[PDB]
């Protein structure tokens with residue numbers, strides 16, 4: 001009687017979605033992440049870079 | 050005659066006449082919050 005735990009604002013699914021979006025953007029795009037180039041740089045080119 | 054919890058708080062009790070054990074649970078409670086878009090715009094409020 002007097003103690004309460006409050007839920008966090010962002011649920012687990014939202015955290016997972018944020019991580020998924022960030023990694024997908026970093027993988028699909030390359031140095032063009034951020035600015036909406038949205039073309040798709042080949043991965044081996046990024047590795048060579 | 051009765052049970053106790055980890056914090057040594059009563060959770061059950063034998064009725065004095067009918068030798069049966071009744072569970073005990075504290076009554077539900079919680080905080081209160083008020084939502085406002087600002088008196089600068091309106092006077093509607095919603096509570097949680």
Ligand SMILES: *[C@@H]1O[C@H](CO)[C@@H](O)[C@H](O)[C@H]1NC(C)=O
Pocket residue numbers: 089090
């Ligand atoms: C808030 O109040 C100021 C004056 O105190 C007024 O100029 C402004 O427009 C108000 N904002 C809104 C969103 O109504």
